[PDB]
Design a binder for this molecule. Sequence first.
Ligand SMILES: CCCCOC(C)=O
Ligand SMILES: [Cl-]
Ligand SMILES: [Cl-]
Ligand SMILES: [Cl-]
Ligand SMILES: [Cl-]
Ligand SMILES: [Cl-]
Ligand SMILES: [Cl-]
Ligand SMILES: [Cl-]
Ligand SMILES: [Cl-]
Ligand SMILES: [Cl-]
Lengths: 306, 307
Amino acid sequence: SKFAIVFPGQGSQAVGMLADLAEQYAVVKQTFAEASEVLGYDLWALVQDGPVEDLNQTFRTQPALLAASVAIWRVWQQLGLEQPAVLAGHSLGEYSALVCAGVIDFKQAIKLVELRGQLMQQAVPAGTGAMYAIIGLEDEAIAKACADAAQGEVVSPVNFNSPGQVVIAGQKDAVERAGVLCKEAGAKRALPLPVSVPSHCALMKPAADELAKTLAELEFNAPQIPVINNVDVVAETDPVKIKDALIRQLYSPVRWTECVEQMSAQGVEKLIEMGPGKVLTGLTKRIVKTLEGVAVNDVASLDAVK
Amino acid sequence: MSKFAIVFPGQGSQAVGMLADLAEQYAVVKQTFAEASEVLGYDLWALVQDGPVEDLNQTFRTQPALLAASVAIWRVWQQLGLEQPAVLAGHSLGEYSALVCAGVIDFKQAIKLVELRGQLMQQAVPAGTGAMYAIIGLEDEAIAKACADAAQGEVVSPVNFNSPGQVVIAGQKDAVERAGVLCKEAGAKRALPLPVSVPSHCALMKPAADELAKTLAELEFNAPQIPVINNVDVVAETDPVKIKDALIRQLYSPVRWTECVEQMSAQGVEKLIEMGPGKVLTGLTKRIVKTLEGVAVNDVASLDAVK
Ligand SMILES: CCCCOC(C)=O
Ligand SMILES: [Cl-]
Ligand SMILES: [Cl-]
Ligand SMILES: [Cl-]
Ligand SMILES: [Cl-]
Ligand SMILES: [Cl-]
Ligand SMILES: [Cl-]
Ligand SMILES: [Cl-]
Ligand SMILES: [Cl-]
Ligand SMILES: [Cl-]
């Protein structure tokens, strides 16, 4: 195949998502119904009606996004559409990729990502962590800025999203010091992100240790379609190593630009974003200028890509 | 159609890729964003379609992006010759969208205004000194009591009345955190800390509002062509100086959305149609007066529901 499918994460959710697709394909509401059975609440109703403040809490957003992406995947499979060459996803999206590749049972994945969200929220006391988007600065300069700012505390790049789009996170004061240094190094902008969880840095390690205990209780199978992991940019096939990659993913940076580059290096020419919004699609052509990127999350978009 | 109102969303309803479908089909959509871009000095449509999402989410960018989105849809609605609504209203930023659509404020001037509004809001208090919580399951008077008990001499107040049992509070960070605990002790079902730096719609915005007033003094406002119910007083104001004043008071006062929806029902409105990205306000209507839940309009297919 000359195309890949990628799955978005936190931030891509929207009240009303997938309404159009649900009207035409019963598998959408069926997928959400399965998710609701293991969550103990009506996930479809939350997604369609809100309250949005509840949908935006990570322990609800994660299963909402996982259900959304898996529902679209199920429509794709129902139509017997050609298989993608490889899958990948951004942070939560990696779980979506693993379900679609047959590694994790969907119902079990829904409970797993709900737990993942809970552990992330409970990881550090609110107000002690911070995240900043650094725009227009080379990865090497940002790494240096973080190293100099650290001064015994945690501060590191946590997302490599596109050339010139990098997110850093860690202890609040250290991140703030790093922002100043990035600006002094020439960054165009250093944007404080409204978030309490300093995701993907060493502060999440205790939470990862707890997540590891839960992964020991769930069966993972070999991937049916290759899945490129965020932590190592590897299409891992050993299920225990896939679990290890999820554990490490939690406290390690998301190497998204490399994931996309890896897809291109293999011969993929198009990335289909399977989930709400078009966030990842915006990154695709910034990473590899020749790649085509399209989002599929409604009847119109599904129809155009068939 | 039955007598209806159009309501406009605020901060949170933006999404990367919004209006792509509609922009492929009707020239006025990109024309509208191009007018905004002229004023802003950057390509707003490019930001909305490609990100960076972190830039789109900064309030001084989000506000013009949403204003442009809603006005774009309004222009398509008019081009297609769809029926006039009886009244308009919107949530916080959405009030500006309503005022442009009602012919009160010139679109390009409004774009400048909301960019400035966002900037002043961001600068109001140092980041880390304010907080905001969503409280679910308590009546307005219990929330007010929790905030008073929490204050300890600081500012903490309800800042949005979104539906019965859905209230947002904001103010000084510690005070707001105390208020969250007090709401739970009073029987709130949920007290959710929100990832937001700016404690909007409380007294901490008074200085920003004073500065916004200086700019409003330089923009021409005209009498509305369609009634607009304001968030601050729940009044269909027709005097443009009073509309300006309502915008300045709005900044440091609570958004009385529940009452806005009820007042629409009072004026004979049978349905509220949400006009902008997402379906956020559509869900609130359901929780205020069930029978006023109307169709949502923001993509090509949905224009059929209102034709
Ligand atoms: C055919 C719909 C456009 C009529 O104008 C109105 C309702 O003001
Ligand atoms: Cl989010
Ligand atoms: Cl929120
Ligand atoms: Cl995540
Ligand atoms: Cl900026
Ligand atoms: Cl697309
Ligand atoms: Cl807000
Ligand atoms: Cl937002
Ligand atoms: Cl375009
Ligand atoms: Cl606002």
